[PDB]
Design a protein around this ligand. Structure first.
Ligand SMILES: CN(C)CCCNS(=O)(=O)c1cccc(Nc2nc(OCC3CCCCC3)c3[nH]cnc3n2)c1
Length: 269
């Protein structure tokens, strides 16, 4: 029935209000904690089935890491447990939904995001990434569907990746296109595509045809529809070209990107 002793460690202490969305391989529900009333958001990873013992251990190792990060622009982490053969991850609830919901809303009404608000948000999530990279931690999953906004307007980064019937991680990168491996400069790439979707409300390499080889060819040569010159500063447009660079060596460190956003956030007050 109820068990305060465990605290946030058993699903018996929450009331599932509604299902807010379905993740990559997970379903996230809104909930209320009965013990103290705080609103929390559950994550059903569905690792019970179709997963080996090592992959489960790996999934935990990521959770143990994500719990160590404490930052204003990273979603708070409350509890992770296995109950009834289902890994539930209860995280802080952000009123304004995932960033993709904001993009899909704006796109629905055919109005672009002002440049002054792009920097307002972009600087926040850059702060989170500089925090991680400075501690030798790569996010490995930066997409609009995993960026969250509070009613106040603050932006938060989210959970780590669950990659552990063809699938596309929203922002596929060249290092991973070939058998090279995810690295730090590969997180910038995702960050670059994110800045582009805020401005254009559509992924840069989103195409009319979903062919993997067709899309792969469009990533080798950085060919993508440029942004409206009038509405978005050259400072921004060049920062996108800078991050969406095939060769990882040419991309910038998260700091330089972080410094540009700060400077540009002040300019567009
Ligand atoms: C839609 N309404 C009628 C019903 C709910 C009334 N609004 S609401 O309660 O404040 C509301 C609605 C939607 C989102 C959010 N914010 C939120 N959503 C998450 O789910 C992530 C999931 C996985 C990726 C993409 C799909 C969503 C979070 N996960 C961690 N933190 C999260 N914060 C809040």
């Amino acid at each position: 029935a109820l068990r305060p002793d465990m605290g946030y460690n058993t699903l018996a202490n929450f009331r599932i209000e509604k299902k807010i969305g379905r993740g990559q391989f997970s379903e996230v529900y809104r909930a209320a904690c009965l013990l103290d009333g705080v609103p929390v958001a559950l994550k059903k990873v569905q690792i019970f089935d179709l997963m080996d013992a090592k992959a489960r251990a790996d999934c935990i190792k990521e959770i143990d890491l994500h719990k160590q990060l404490n930052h204003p622009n990273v979603i708070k982490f409350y509890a992770s447990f296995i109950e009834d053969n289902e890994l539930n991850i209860v995280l802080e609830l952000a009123d304004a939904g995932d960033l993709s919901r904001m993009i899909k809303h704006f796109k629905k009404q055919k109005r672009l995001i002002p440049e002054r608000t792009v920097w307002k948000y972009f600087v926040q999530l850059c702060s989170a990434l500089e925090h991680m990279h400075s501690r030798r931690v790569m996010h490995r999953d930066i997409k609009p569907a995993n960026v969250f906004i509070t009613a106040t307007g603050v932006v938060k980064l989210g959970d780590f990746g669950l990659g552990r019937l063809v699938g596309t991680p929203y922002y596929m990168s060249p290092e991973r296109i070939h058998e090279n491996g995810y690295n730090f400069k590969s997180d910038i790439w995702s960050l670059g595509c994110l800045l582009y979707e805020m401005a254009a409300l559509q992924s840069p390499f989103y195409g009319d045809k979903m062919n993997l080889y067709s899309l792969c060819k469009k990533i080798e040569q950085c060919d993508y529809p440029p942004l409206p010159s009038d509405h978005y500063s050259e400072e921004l447009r060049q920062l996108v070209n800078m991050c969406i660079n095939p060769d990882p060596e040419k991309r910038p460190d998260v700091t330089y990107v972080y410094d540009v956003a700060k400077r540009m956030h002040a300019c567009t007050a």
